[PDB]
Design a binder for this molecule. Sequence first.
Ligand SMILES: Cn1nc(S(N)(=O)=O)s/c1=N\S(=O)(=O)c1ccc(C(C)(C)C)cc1
Ligand SMILES: Cn1nc(S(N)(=O)=O)s/c1=N\S(=O)(=O)c1ccc(C(C)(C)C)cc1
Ligand SMILES: [Zn+2]
Ligand SMILES: [Zn+2]
Lengths: 218, 226
Amino acid sequence: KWDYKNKENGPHRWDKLHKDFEVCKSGKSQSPINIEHYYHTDLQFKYAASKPKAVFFTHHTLKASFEPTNHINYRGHDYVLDNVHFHAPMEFLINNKTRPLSAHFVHKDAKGRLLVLAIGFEEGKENPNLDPILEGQNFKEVALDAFLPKSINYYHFNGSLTAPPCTEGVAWFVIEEPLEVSAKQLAEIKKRMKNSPNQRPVQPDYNTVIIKSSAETR
Amino acid sequence: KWDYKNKENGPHRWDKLHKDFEVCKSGKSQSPINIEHYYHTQDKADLQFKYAASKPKAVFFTHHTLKASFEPTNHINYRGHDYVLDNVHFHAPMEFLINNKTRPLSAHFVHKDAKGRLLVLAIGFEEGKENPNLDPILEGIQKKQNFKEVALDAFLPKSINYYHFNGSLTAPPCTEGVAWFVIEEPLEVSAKQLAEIKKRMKNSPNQRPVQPDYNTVIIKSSAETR
Ligand SMILES: Cn1nc(S(N)(=O)=O)s/c1=N\S(=O)(=O)c1ccc(C(C)(C)C)cc1
Ligand SMILES: Cn1nc(S(N)(=O)=O)s/c1=N\S(=O)(=O)c1ccc(C(C)(C)C)cc1
Ligand SMILES: [Zn+2]
Ligand SMILES: [Zn+2]
């Protein structure tokens, strides 16, 4: 049972717990990393009001799953949202800028490739998109179509899962725009993960090629 | 033992030659691939060249290809990370595909920083004219010791467009984490130059078949070598 704690099952010792998990140690394109040097420079969305198929804290974090009806298109391939989960703190560093929460929209295409999306949260206003996840027969829909800023700066690169098995072949898009969140929610969420911090330390970057581009979500 | 003949030694089947080659099949950032989707960008003046025409420490054929070794007097500085040209070896045909474009030959400029980091600099060859940079090489297989010079600063183009991404070495152990600069511009090679090296590789095609892409982020940009 791998964990994020400072002991033996910790992030630094993940490869020597299971053997599929060597990649947490042997990989060169491991996520997360500190994004500070990048190059400035085809994304489509099928996000809609969706009922989470399930909501739960799992494998050390809180997570919401989804019916395979909501998609993202990249390179002419629909990737399917399974779930979106949370990390506190934010796993990814943006030019040494830190946020108290991020969220990962995890997707998969027909070939098999994963495409995940990360965005930051800054402390602030009460964020109404969070309640149906915090609320987990008659499941209330979640506003996937209203979650992200209409205008978004993203960073895109090739990386890894940030929790075991640290599988590679993941397309990372990380948004520079933060989603504001009131502090009562943050405290409430940090504790739905057992007041235990689920952030992987920055992994080695061996000059990951990153693009900065922009898009309109809706 | 590993070769391109689709027997026991075939190229995807590399993982089963050494278990050192497991990344050759299990790897996610594997080269070569079709350079067909990419990002147009600028020049932050990142990659710089202080190359010079230099005499090889040794010339020899190795591991299904021709290769030349070099003194650490020649370096590449990039983003504050200096690499040493270690050697130059060849592939016919070219392994990386440029917009689905096929070249009859490549050459790989291998670089190394103090670390384990790799930097390969690849450029193509098409049928045609005599390659004056190559002319000093086919005479280089007839000799040891004082090998004939390579006009290496006269090898590459004065002005250069490349494609850049993180990939792997293209031959076993198929090591990933290799910074690829792939040049679209071809150098020319005579059919005489074309035919003779293929026999120094036994007319045996030494190209790793195209690997799966996991949405590899590639940028297209340009620079000056000379
Ligand atoms: C363990 N892990 N880490 C992640 S991160 N933080 O890099 O986005 S996602 C994850 N596991 S997961 O989201 O439940 C998941 C992993 C793999 C799949 C498939 C589609 C089977 C490849 C589907 C869901
Ligand atoms: C295995 N291999 N693959 C290559 S390709 N086709 O991706 O450019 S070059 C190669 N082997 S090699 O050029 O002799 C070599 C030279 C130097 C090193 C280091 C260990 C970095 C000094 C490692 C391998
Ligand atoms: Zn995550
Ligand atoms: Zn090569």
